C-alpha cells in the first residue's frame with residue numbers, strides 16, 4: 008500500500024493541472040512517478056495557476072514539478088514540450104491520460120493512444136469537457152461510446168479499442184463554455200479512472 | 209465562443225467572492241466585463257480571502273480586481289462602495305446578481321431589482337444560503353418559488369417578477385450556520401444560472 | 410447567531426486539517442473554541458499543508474492555529490502532542506472528533522471515546538476513509554453500524570455506544586488509496602455531523 012507505477016499526463020492546462028494536483032496528493036498508493044508533458048507557459052488568463060503562486064512566463068509543467076521538492080516520496084517530472092508525431096518517444100509508462108480540449112487535438116491524441124498501447128500502457132482521454140456546472144460526467148469504453156459524439160465517432164473510425172473516455176459530451180461547438188466546477192468534476196472522475204487502470208498490474 | 213456581456217455582482221463576501229472567482233475562470237464564453245460592488249474590507253474572519261492571498265484591510269473588491277492584471281482578457285472593475293438609493297446608478301449591464309448579507313438587506317435587494325429591471329438587466333439573488341453541508345440548492349423563478357420561503361414571500365409582497373432565486377431556503381432564523389461547502393455549492397449553481405441569463409441576452 | 414461551544418479534533422493530518430479548515434470557516438455559528446491535538450510536523454509529503462503556506466518542520470497544529478490570529482472570532486488551541494493513556498485529560502469540550510492519521514489507532518480511539526463520554530461530550534470518529542472518488546460516505550450510530558466492518562466490530566466488542574461513525578467503509582487493507590476528493594467529501598460530512606452534535610452547546 009505504497010505508490011507503484013508511472014502515469015503520463017499529456018496536457019497540463021486547466022484540466023490537466025487539476026488532474027496532476029489530484030494525483031500528487033494521493034497517499035497509500037497511486038503512481039510512484041508522474042510525468043506531465045505540455046509546452047505552454049502560464050499566461051494572465053491562467054488564473055488557477057496564478058492563485059497557487061505560478062508566475063506569468065513559467066512553464067506550466069515546471070510550476071507543477073516545483074510542488075514536488077527534494078523530500079517528496081513520488082517523483083514528478085515536468086516535460087516542457089509540445090507532442091508531435093515525432094517526439095512520441097516521451098510517451099511511455101503504465102497509464103497515459105491525454106487531456107486537451109477540442110477537435111484540433113484528435114489526430115495527435117489518436118497517435119499517442121496507438122503508441123502507448125503498442126508499449127503496453129492503458130489509455131484514457133476526454134469526450135467533451137464543456138458545461139456550465141451540473142452536466143453528468145460519464146465514463147465509457149470507446150466501443151460503447153455514443154457514435155453521435157464526433158470525438159467517439161472519430162476514434163472508432165480510427166480503429167481505437169480498449170480506451171477509456173471521460174467527459175460531459177459537450178464540445179466547443181455546443182453553447183456552453185468551460186467552467187471551473189465542471190473541470191473539477193471531470194478531473195475527479197479522471198483521477199479515479201486512472202487509479203483503476205493503474206491497478207491493472 | 210468568446211467572452212460577451214457584462215455581469216454586476218453586488219456583494220463580494222464569502223458567497224460573492226466565490227461567484228466572482230467562478231466567473232473569472234470561465235473560458236470560451238462567460239462575461240467580457242465583471243463589475244463587483246461592495247464597501248467592506250477583508251477582516252481576520254474572512255479566511256477564504258486570507259487563504260487566497262488577501263491582506264486584512266484590503267477592500268474585498270480591490271483584492272478581486274487585483275487578480276485581473278493587464279493581460280487578462282476580461283475586464284474586472286472593483287467598486288468599493290455599498291449600494292444605497294444614492295448610487296443605484298452604478299448598477300448596469302446584462303445580468304445583476306445580488307449576494308449581500310449583514311443586517312437588513314431585503315429592502316435594498318428589492319430596490320436593486322426594480323432599478324436593474326428598469327434598465328433592462330436580468331436579475332438573480334439568493335433565497336437563503338444557511339446549511340450544514342448537504343442541503344439541496346434549488347433554483348426557481350420568483351413566481352414559482354416554494355411559498356414557504358420567507359425571502360420569496362417578501363419579494364412577492366414587493367411585486368417583484370421575472371427574477372431568479374437560488375439557495376437552500378435556510379435563513380438566519382434557522383438553527384444551521386453558514387458553512388463553506390454549502391457556499392461553494394450555492395456559488396457553482398449561481399454561476400451556471402448567470403451563464404444561462406447571459407446567453408438569453 | 411454567534412459561535413458557541415468547544416470541539417476537540419484529535420488528529421490534524423490530511424483529513425483532520427480539512428475538518429479544521431471547514432470548522433474555522435463557519436460563519437454565524439459553529440464552535441467558539443477548536444482544540445486541535447496532534448504531535449506531527451509538516452513533511453515534504455504534506456502537500457495540502459504546503460499549498461496553503463505551511464513550512465516543513467512546523468507542527469501541523471501550530472500552522473492551523475496561526476490562521477486564527479488576534480482579530481479572529483473563535484480561538485484555535487493547537488496542542489502539539491499525541492494522545493496516550495497518560496494525557497487523556499487533554500480531551501474536553503462539547504464534541505470530540507477522532508480523525509487520527511497513521512493507522513493502528515483503534516485502542517486509543519476507544520480510550521478517547523470512554524473518557525470523552527465520562528466528561529459529557531458527544532463523540533464521532535471514522536469507519537474507513539479510503540476510496541478513489543465517488544464512494545458513498547455514510548453516517549451511522551455505532552449500534553446500527555455493520556459488524557462486517559472491522560472498525561465497527563472492534564468498537565462494538567469494546568462496548569462503545571452513543572457514538573457516530575463516518576466514512577466510506579474502505580480501509581488500509583482494501584485496494585483503494587486515499588484520494589483528496591474522498592477526503593474532502595468525508596471532511597464535509599464530518600463537519601455537518603459535528604455541527605448537529607454541537608447543537609445546544
Ligand SMILES: Nc1ncnc2c1ncn2[C@@H]1O[C@H](COP(=O)(O)OP(=O)(O)O)[C@@H](O)[C@H]1O
Pocket residue numbers: 218219220221222223224245246247248268289290291292307308309310313316337386391436
Ligand atoms: N448594500 C450593500 N451593497 C454592497 N454590498 C453589501 C451591501 N450590504 C452588504 N453587502 C456585502 O455583503 C457581503 C456579505 O458577505 P458575508 O458576510 O461574508 O456573507 P455571505 O457568506 O452570505 O456572502 C459583505 O461583504 C457586505 O459588505
